[PDB]
């Protein structure tokens, strides 16, 4: 039978497997043990290690009965017919361009806020999540730290997911504004460029939810993040959100000019949406809960640990278009011509890849660059797609 | 004596003046009996008419009794060596060109606030005070109105008044910006372009005695603006008060944006400033007190009907060159081409008009054209240079 | 004819009358030449007058012509059928209590807004206006000075008047709290215990036009005010507003303890309902304006100069009721045990006072005794009942 | 050698102990492994398993080795010195408490905020922490949930740690209100009666970290917290915070009223502080932490599984005093009647207990009785004394 099968290939010519030899083979291979889709299987293991002392032999019976739950992806995963079938050479250049990255220093920790000008200049992590569930991290890839600007996606997203392209983008641009970011003025017909600058995000999270009060806002786009993270760690920092909605006289700014000029949709409190739109930068996030959301936005809106339907296919496609082209803002154009993916970058140190149908990535760094990137991210970003081709118009 | 003088110029051939014969010749010069300066005269001639049933003459004893006190004026306004000697030409000028723009008409009274769009189409008046007291006034010259933009000039003239032009300056900028009075852009050295347009004006609101609150900063402002005016009407308006600080998110976006540039002195809340500076707007004069507070202007400084100095010369100076330049926007060129003269406008119809070293003048009409002007007052402004040879470079 | 015995009336045993002799007979009564209800006549005598030099005879025919217009109301002056047939009487009744008043002194004039510690301690005014036209005043019965708490019974008529008693008392009490205005406590079922304590009149502020904004609620009341005055002075003091808006802590408790015991009509935003509740107290008067709108109060609901209906009965009844047992707190009992009218204090010195059916009243005095009641008010009060004979139950 | 003893002790009349043997033999008594006072001697075991594949025998040797740093707690700990000699049978106790206090039911789940009326009414955990280190927990106890008014007690004491009792005091009473937690009404000489009651926890929650923003103190406060729970869960609830700062008209109410009477430090915004209050109450624990907060207040001011100093001596002493005397509000009388114990309670559920050199302890079920306690923690509360003799006036 299959089972049996696979109990030849882990073997070598033996008659018994011990458990821990079958623990290392599959995480040889990119999976972790705390899969959801294997939850059960290792609970079956569990039982078997509560009768033996210490060790226990699985020759026939009880190595069927662990693997008959669900018995589809282990063999995909030991027949290598996942996305990268050997992720040991992946994850050693993840290491090779970590370390190359590591060399690179000198930036400038942000400073407007005492909450990011508190991390040393040597934190430095990169996670890397695939389609398929393999999962790989390097560096200080679980230290709390809030996305700041690479919530933008996400949040956009959602919307179209709930209204409709049509709809959304009845309110929002849909091409490169060609300055900064910050910058206070509209398109054409009086509307944000896009919803990438902060202009189109205070607009994007004004259609979010609409008619309830803050307190459903948060815990809809709260639990929207955690089944797009795959339940992953996803907080909130109150420290940094009573910093940052005192330091925002920009975004106030904006948020007036684009209350003046009709940018939102009918009964629309702009100062509580400002506030709103602070709370959902004050998000936490790991390099590794980052990673798992990036890779849900690149697999097809399903989540690639749960295998679970988060956003509309139209949704996602519409994400990773306007990332591409505005993601990094007036830099986009320069970022597209040696990189060619979508990315996003957010104040705090943090650089959002997606590779479309293979992985989404975070890499984090707080000290920034003259741009607002972090500069071992941007490096990474570089080294990676000139030693791995994956600029989008490679052959 | 010079007071026998006097007498027989007013009389012809006759033993005695009778009292009405005696105020409508001072009337026919220009001077209003209520003139301050004149005050102890008129007590003395009720004094005269609380013994007479009716009539009373005067003959050498009481008119000399009467007119001793402060005998500086009456020479010199029987004299005819006042700035205009023949007052009741200039003034028939005044009607025919009043006449002349009531009859142009088509507009748009201003709607942003149901307070301004409240005026009939139909009310329009002109007031003209002389820089030696001479007054005249034609139409709705009493209906109070809401100064709006035209308080601006009087902003900042009170500032170098009691700061300086060097540390005054040292905030704003001294040139014409070039664009619309709201728009959101600064100078080189990220500071307002002048202090005429809002930018500028919601900064130098805040160098205005600062430190203490705004009950009081409304309330030396308006002892300035009633000294200024020469004890005229200046109230307040409530309602459009209201309104306008609820219909002001223009304003709340310039001040955030110049919060955020560091363009205000150190300790100063913006929002208090943005509320203290709606009430400013929302200050009520008449077409009678604007002509003084003109006329204050243009004089020296020194009030017109009252001969006290409310403003240094370096003050008036500074606010004449900017109302020059920047008193009509990016339409101050154009005004200045054809008029030439210091000039400010509100949206709630209104133009306030320096000649220097001749008058002060107010024309106010609520129909609007697109500029935001009052139609009626830019016709009026436009005939009176070419009937009256005003324009400051004729010859 | 009618008009032929009021000639003769007014003449004795002679031809012609002149004019100056009718208007010193009219103004005897108590009459003002200025009363809206002989605007007509006056406008004809100034048509008299602009024909001959100085003075003029009227016999039989001008004078026709002239009392021609509306012939109702001189008969009833001139016959002695008013209110009260010798004003001259009542008028040096009220000048010996001025004078008797005015000997008292030692106070203290409030000092918690710099606005209300701004006034001597001398100014002492009183203004009297008879349900029928007749007006008397003595002192500084024309400076301007806020309401402050004078205003609450007029705020509450207002609303009986425009939603019914039944509606207005559902949601305040009808009984004296007996305790100080200020108190946080409601009645039995969680309401206001009146509307005479500082929290049945901010609920009661909240049922006047509701659904518009403070501008248009402002406007209605203003105008309200101005047709219960009698088209006298009824003004703002937006120092003292601004002022009482930043010293208000106990106002806001009381409102916040109401929006929690659910004592709003539904869809009331409280604090701008608060910010309303200051801008009323901060409506200034004179004592000739407050007088005529006491006198409005006493009469019918009907105006006292202008014969305009301003308030429904049933609202004229319950405001006195309200103001008998509640109109001094605390100090009602006492206040009704001496003087037994209803009658209303401002902390700004101002005593507002209604004889029913006989006239209104207002004495206005800064400096406060320890109860917070113009000392030289509280006398005249206690001294015009013991001298006048008008307490509710003498005989 | 003591060495060589343990070693005896541990084993029986064998030569070597197995690792596992030891480890259970450690948690028989009550500590866990994850103890930071051990955690080198884990990292050593750890060292010694990357060795052999299964198993490993400590003689003489290896035992010695890992057990030498820091050889003073596993004397007291396997010499029975501690507080608690057996904890296995108060363990024992505490399930039959939790089992007899689960079938209790019937309360009504907080709901005047959505994020509380969403726990089923069925989790129910109760978690103890030593004062020298043994721990056990029974049900749902690490459910994330806020502290609410547990926080109080915490909040004080660290005020007087940094500033002291008599300037503390300085500010709130000393002495049981005789009323409602939420009741409007201040001491004799107008203050606070207790820092227990909403009123005196204001005041104290701005006598912490003054001068500095809201995002300093609370990272003050989140720190000492994070040291005083021995770095366990401490964490913020964004979305009950943003409902909290919601629905808090009576706390406004509060704070309002003590602005006006004056009973905070000089240079304190008291909106801020309000929002920092509510901030305060929207941290969330788990039985976990919260047991071993209570058990650093029971100790000395000391942490109980770190062995650090967090507070001072008289801040304990302080906060334990006032905790039983008003821990309870109007219900402490009956609660020290019956219990006699220090305590406090959170609308959430969450009983925080003391007993003073023994433990701290937290009791969580979200429903609640009539009286605002958590059902089930009230009853294990009285069942916990009258079973183990901790009432304070016991024999």
Same mark, same amino acid.
């Given at each position: 039978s299959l089972e049996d099968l696979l109990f030849y290939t882990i073997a070598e010519g033996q008659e018994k497997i011990p458990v821990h030899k079958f623990i290392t083979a599959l995480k040889s291979?990119?999976? %972790?043990?705390?899969?959801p889709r294997l939850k059960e299987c290792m609970d079956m293991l569990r039982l078997t290690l509560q009768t033996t002392s210490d060790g226990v032999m699985l020759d026939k019976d009880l190595f069927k009965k662990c693997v008959q #739950?669900? =018995?589809?992806?282990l063999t995909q995963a030991f027949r290598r017919?996942?996305? =990268?079938? !050997?992720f040991m050479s992946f994850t050693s250049h993840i290491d090779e361009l970590y370390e190359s990255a590591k060399k690179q220093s000198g930036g400038k920790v942000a400073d407007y806020i005492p909450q990011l000008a508190k991390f040393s200049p040597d934190l430095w992590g990169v996670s890397v999540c695939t389609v398929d569930g393999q999962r790989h991290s390097t560096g200080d890839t679980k230290v709390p730290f809030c996305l700041q600007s690479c919530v933008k996606p996400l949040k956009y997203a959602i919307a179209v997911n709930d209204l409709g392209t049509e709809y959304v983008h009845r309110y929002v641009?849909?091409?490169? #504004?060609?300055?900064?970011?910050?910058?206070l003025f509209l398109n054409e !017909? !009086?509307?944000?460029?896009?919803?990438?600058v902060n202009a189109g995000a205070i607009v994007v999270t004004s259609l =979010?939810?609409?008619?309830?009060n803050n307190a459903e806002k948060f815990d809809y786009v709260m639990q929207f993040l955690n089944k797009m993270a795959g339940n992953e760690y996803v907080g909130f920092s109150n420290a940094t959100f009573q910093s940052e909605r005192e330091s925002g006289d920009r975004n106030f700014a904006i948020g007036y000019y684009l209350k003046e000029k009709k940018?939102?949709?009918?009964?629309?409190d702009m100062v509580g949406i400002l506030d709103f739109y602070f709370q959902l930068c004050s998000i936490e996030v790991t390099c590794e809960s980052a990673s798992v959301m990036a890779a849900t936005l690149a697999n097809?809106?399903?989540?690639?640990?749960?295998?679970? %339907?988060?956003?509309?296919p139209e949704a996602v496609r519409n994400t990773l278009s306007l990332m591409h082209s505005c993601?990094?803002? !007036?830099?986009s154009g320069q970022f597209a011509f040696h990189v060619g993916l979508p990315a996003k970058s957010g104040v705090a140190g943090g650089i959002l890849l997606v590779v479309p149908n293979v992985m989404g990535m975070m890499c984090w760094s707080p000290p920034l660059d003259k741009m607002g990137n972090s500069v071992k991210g941007i490096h990474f970003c570089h080294d990676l797609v000139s030693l791995c081709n994956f600029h989008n118009y490679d052959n």
């Amino acid at each position: 039978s299959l089972e049996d099968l696979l109990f030849y290939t882990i073997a070598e010519g033996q008659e018994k497997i011990p458990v821990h030899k079958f623990i290392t083979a599959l995480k040889s291979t990119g999976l %972790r043990t705390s899969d959801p889709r294997l939850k059960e299987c290792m609970d079956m293991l569990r039982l078997t290690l509560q009768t033996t002392s210490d060790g226990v032999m699985l020759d026939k019976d009880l190595f069927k009965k662990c693997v008959q #739950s669900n =018995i589809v992806l282990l063999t995909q995963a030991f027949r290598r017919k996942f996305v =990268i079938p !050997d992720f040991m050479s992946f994850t050693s250049h993840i290491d090779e361009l970590y370390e190359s990255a590591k060399k690179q220093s000198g930036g400038k920790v942000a400073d407007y806020i005492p909450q990011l000008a508190k991390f040393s200049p040597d934190l430095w992590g990169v996670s890397v999540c695939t389609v398929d569930g393999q999962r790989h991290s390097t560096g200080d890839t679980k230290v709390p730290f809030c996305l700041q600007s690479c919530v933008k996606p996400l949040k956009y997203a959602i919307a179209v997911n709930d209204l409709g392209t049509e709809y959304v983008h009845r309110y929002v641009g849909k091409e490169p #504004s060609g300055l900064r970011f910050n910058k206070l003025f509209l398109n054409e !017909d !009086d509307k944000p460029h896009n919803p990438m600058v902060n202009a189109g995000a205070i607009v994007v999270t004004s259609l =979010i939810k609409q008619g309830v009060n803050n307190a459903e806002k948060f815990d809809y786009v709260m639990q929207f993040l955690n089944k797009m993270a795959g339940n992953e760690y996803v907080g909130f920092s109150n420290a940094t959100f009573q910093s940052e909605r005192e330091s925002g006289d920009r975004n106030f700014a904006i948020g007036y000019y684009l209350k003046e000029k009709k940018c939102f949709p009918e009964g629309t409190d702009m100062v509580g949406i400002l506030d709103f739109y602070f709370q959902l930068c004050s998000i936490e996030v790991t390099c590794e809960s980052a990673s798992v959301m990036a890779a849900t936005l690149a697999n097809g809106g399903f989540c690639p640990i749960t295998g679970e %339907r988060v956003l509309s296919p139209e949704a996602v496609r519409n994400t990773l278009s306007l990332m591409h082209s505005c993601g990094m803002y !007036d830099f986009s154009g320069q970022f597209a011509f040696h990189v060619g993916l979508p990315a996003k970058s957010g104040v705090a140190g943090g650089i959002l890849l997606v590779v479309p149908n293979v992985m989404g990535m975070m890499c984090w760094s707080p000290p920034l660059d003259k741009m607002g990137n972090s500069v071992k991210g941007i490096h990474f970003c570089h080294d990676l797609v000139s030693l791995c081709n994956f600029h989008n118009y490679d052959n």
